[PDB]
Amino acid sequence: QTTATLNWPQQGRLDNVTAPLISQAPLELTATVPCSVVRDLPPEGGLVFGTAPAEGRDAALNAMLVNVTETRVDVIVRNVVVASVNRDRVAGPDCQRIEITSNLDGTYADFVGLTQISGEDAGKLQRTGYPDPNLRPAIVGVFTDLTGPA
């Protein structure tokens, strides 16, 4: 069997990349996002990356969107908020990465370096998600909102 893997920023450029799958769901998805790309985003912010155009028909109901609002950073997957985190914390000097693994086990958006502050625990790591295999985002491409070199 011939296997195919889609990686991206391709050749050092953060261009949008269309790759519409026929099965409408990948096997795995591993999207490590650093945090030197959240502090430079404009104050109102947009996407960081997403597997569908931000304004497509039912863009969030079917795909993954790692948004950046003016106060928050949420990872929406099929209208299921996974690991929303206040942006003033993630943009600080205390965070290193954001690992958004999504596979047959479950969709878990870990925030390496951040500890929970609310939610009746305030003690566990920021890894939040759901062990549902039916939360794999329908890949149409990777449509970031950044620009310049990778």
Side-chain angles (χ1 to χ4, degrees), residues 24-88:
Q24 300 176 10
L27 267 193
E28 270 73 3
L29 192 151
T30 313
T32 295
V33 181
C35 275
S36 303
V37 302
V38 170
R39 67 181 74 259
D40 60 6
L41 268 172
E44 74 293 330
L47 289 186
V48 161
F49 89 89
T51 79
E55 57 270 0
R57 175 163 183 254
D58 282 355
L61 177 56
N62 288 279
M64 166 195 298
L65 304 171
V66 180
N67 297 94
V68 164
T69 312
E70 75 288 324
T71 77
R72 273 147 289 166
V73 173
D74 55 355
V75 181
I76 313 175
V77 174
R78 296 185 172 261
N79 275 342
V80 173
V81 177
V82 174
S84 158
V85 173
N86 209 299
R87 175 184 165 183
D88 47 16

Side-chain angles (χ1 to χ4, degrees), residues 17 23 35 39 46 59 75 98 108 118 121 125:
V17 173
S23 51
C35 275
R39 67 181 74 259
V75 181
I98 299 167
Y108 284 116
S118 180
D121 162 80
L125 274 297

Side-chain angles (χ1 to χ4, degrees), residues 124-140:
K124 312 146 189 152
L125 274 297
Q126 203 46 49
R127 174 178 174 189
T128 315
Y130 299 90
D132 204 16
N134 290 340
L135 278 194
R136 299 196 295 281
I139 301 283
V140 163

